């Protein structure tokens, strides 16, 4: 019994366990996880169409909004479901050959698969409406998406390990995520905000990731200065190292 084999078996078990819980009992979760993006699409199209037309006459609103909204939804889902993974299956650690990290990575892969399915469905329904869906540079987009996924999973694991035995922290990080919806500039193009507050907004790694994903997805998309991938990449690597180290230090204390 190699450790990889039992790890894969428990991951598949834990994975389908998270699936059953997250998806509806009547096989209906696809309905709401497809309804969440379209409502935001409708309200932002009915609220900011002419503003985007005044912004730039080059890229239409639906595809530009989807290509930033779906990665942000994946990031927020990764953080939220990852930080609550350990304090949701406390009765599961009674059996041996299981660890909290198995639960957190099962939730991570479930969220990744669900959001990938939603992204593919949105791209298909966008191409069915005569829009532009094919990425011009797909490899850079894949790399940016991988970096964003790693950053989100790392932040979720860090919040899961750090905020054990204090649920109240999980209460406040949600209110830290609401302004991040508007700070990241996913809805409106960042080219319109004046530079007077740009240097404070360049410290958001997801902002850099979203602009780089849009640049790699669209042909002839202008990226402003200081949107290098180096800063979010280093942020993700450092946070992942810190979270893995903190989990390794507080290993036996985590499972109880």
């Amino acid at each position: 019994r190699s450790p990889w084999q039992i790890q894969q078996a428990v991951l598949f078990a834990l994975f389908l366990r998270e699936l059953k819980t997250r998806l509806g009992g009547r096989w209906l979760g696809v309905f709401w996880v497809l309804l969440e993006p379209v409502a935001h699409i409708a309200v932002m199209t009915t609220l900011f169409s002419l503003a985007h037309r005044a912004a730039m006459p080059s890229i239409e609103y639906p595809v530009f909004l989807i290509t930033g909204l779906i990665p942000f939804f994946m990031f927020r889902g990764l953080v939220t479901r990852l930080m609550e993974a350990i304090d949701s299956n406390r009765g599961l650690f009674a059996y041996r050959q299981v660890k909290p990290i198995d639960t957190v990575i099962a939730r991570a892969m479930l969220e990744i698969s669900l959001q990938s399915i939603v992204y593919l469905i949105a791209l298909g329904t966008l191409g069915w409406l005569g829009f532009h869906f094919l990425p011009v540079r797909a490899l850079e987009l894949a790399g940016v998406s991988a970096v964003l996924i790693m950053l989100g999973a790392s932040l979720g694991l860090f919040f899961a390990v750090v905020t054990n035995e204090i649920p109240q922290a999980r209460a406040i990080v949600r209110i830290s995520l609401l302004p991040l919806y508007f700070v990241s500039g996913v809805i409106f193009p960042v080219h319109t905000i004046p530079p007077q507050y740009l240097p404070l907004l360049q410290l958001n790694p997801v902002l850099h990731l979203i602009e780089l994903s849009r640049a790699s997805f669209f042909p002839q998309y202008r990226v402003l200065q200081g949107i290098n991938l180096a800063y979010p990449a280093g942020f993700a690597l450092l946070s992942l190292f810190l979270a893995l180290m903190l989990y390794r230090l507080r290993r036996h204390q985590l499972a109880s």
């Binding site: 180290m245 903190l246 390794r248 230090l249």
Partner: peptide, 30 residues
């Protein structure tokens, strides 16, 4: 600004010390 620079250096030294302390607690775990 002697005092502001000293305070900033103290803060960054405390953060660096904390980081290496947790690292050296991790590696020492067999």
């Amino acid at each position: 600004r002697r005092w502001y620079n000293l305070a900033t250096l103290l803060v960054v030294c405390c953060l660096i010390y904390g980081v290496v302390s947790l690292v050296v607690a991790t590696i020492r775990d067999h």
